[PDB]
Amino acid sequence: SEISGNYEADDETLRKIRRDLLDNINLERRHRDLQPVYIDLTTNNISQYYSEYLVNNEHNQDFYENAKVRYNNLGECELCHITAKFEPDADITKEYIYDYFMEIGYLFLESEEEKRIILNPANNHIGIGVFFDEIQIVVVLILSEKVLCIQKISQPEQNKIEIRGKMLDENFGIYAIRIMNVDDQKKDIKGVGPEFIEYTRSTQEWMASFELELYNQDRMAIEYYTRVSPDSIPYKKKQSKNEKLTYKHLQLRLRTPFQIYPDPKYAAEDEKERIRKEQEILAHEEQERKEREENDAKRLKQSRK
């Protein structure tokens, strides 16, 4: 307070922190023919939780699996953790925050286990969680392998949902879209098959069009299912009302809590950051363009010998 005021983290600042962590891991991947890691909201949430816990505690896996059971995790997910203090004589502000997070990212870059796992070709989904205290900052990752990847989750209309996702598995297509109550899994919540799914085999991109109104919208998770033979999947077929889809033959893939992906704040902040990036970069490219122009002007004089 008087001497040590509270260091309440900027929500915008931490959002940029994790976004830049993801982009940096994507660059590291692209360095050697590796696809950038995509955004997994469930892994992002779990990593945020574990980073918050780690900042004043130590690496604990029991809490990790307890959170897994709480969120009903699906698929194998591998965890990464680092807890690096702050330098005893290092000054701290936003700029030092950004630079310290980049340095911690590099420290991740110099770990062979961490470099392998966070760049292992086996998995295709990445999530980041960052937290900090008076002393140290904790950075944690969750890596998951899934068949169907989430790419967009927005709000088209007042009461229209619109979520787009590209299928990462060529032999599996989005045939089942159903979910069970996170609080009471036994209770049939909601789901349908291909009568409202637009799937492109050539691109493996599937889009969902459905209906849904305002009831209890905070504290449960998704149940992403997949089935073999997307070709055998009757996409966009108006099935007779006397037939019900059989989801037991359908294999679940990805139990994910539901949140704005991307959240308007997240995407808007990323847009602003990138756009300022290109503006300053174009000023830069003007700087070196005029530099080369005048250098060649001097060279034409020096070419008088």
Binding site: Q155, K160, I163, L212, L214, Y215, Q217, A221, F258
Partner: protein, 202 residues
């Protein structure tokens, strides 16, 4: 080269590390979360008052009550429970209480907590219906030449975005069955009154 395929299947294994911890610790942690969500909405006064219906009925003074005592407590707290549901819950409670022929004073707390969670979800559902009807009426007022018959009837595209607001989330893939259950009559227009009727039928 030649862009050799290929269609390959990545086994999505549900191998999410079943806990190695003793199950007793996990059950204790779930009990702790139950206590947390109980104190969340249960105020200190209600928390201090609900015990007014357990002990004396607990005649043997060893902190237990049977079905009759639990039902008497529930009626004494001014909120009732079903006979079959009460029997189901009590037998489930006794499953882990082999040496006790009754439920503890915390058993009534947990029963009331779950009942209140369910009921409050119900009032949240009702309030959401009222708000959705208000929004639909406002949008209709935005169009001064649309038939009032649509009052209570909504379009396909105005029936999708309302599960990102509050309470206990329904995600993307939680928005397909109830359409089939209602079965719009080949008209792509849905009545939220039908939803009111069908949500509470389970």
């Amino acid at each position: 080269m030649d862009n050799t395929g290929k269609l390959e299947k990545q086994l999505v294994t549900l191998n999410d590390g079943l806990p190695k911890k003793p199950a007793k610790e996990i059950i204790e942690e779930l009990k702790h979360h139950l206590y947390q969500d109980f104190q969340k909405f249960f105020s200190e006064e209600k928390k201090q008052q609900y015990q007014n219906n357990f002990a004396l009925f607990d005649r043997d003074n060893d902190k237990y009550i049977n079905l009759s005592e639990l039902k008497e407590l529930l009626t004494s707290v001014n909120i009732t429970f079903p006979d079959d549901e009460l029997e189901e819950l009590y037998n489930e409670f006794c499953l882990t209480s082999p040496e006790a022929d009754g439920i503890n004073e915390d058993a009534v707390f947990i029963i009331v907590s779950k009942k209140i969670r369910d009921n409050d979800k119900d009032e949240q559902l009702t309030q959401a219906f009222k708000l959705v009807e208000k929004a639909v009426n406002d949008e209709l007022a935005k169009t001064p030449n649309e038939t009032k018959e649509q009052e209570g009837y909504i379009r396909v595209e105005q029936f999708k975005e309302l599960l990102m607001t509050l309470g206990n989330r329904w995600s993307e893939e939680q928005a397909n069955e109830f359409l089939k259950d209602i079965n719009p009559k080949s008209d792509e227009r849905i009545n939220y009154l039908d939803v009111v009727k069908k949500l509470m039928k389970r």
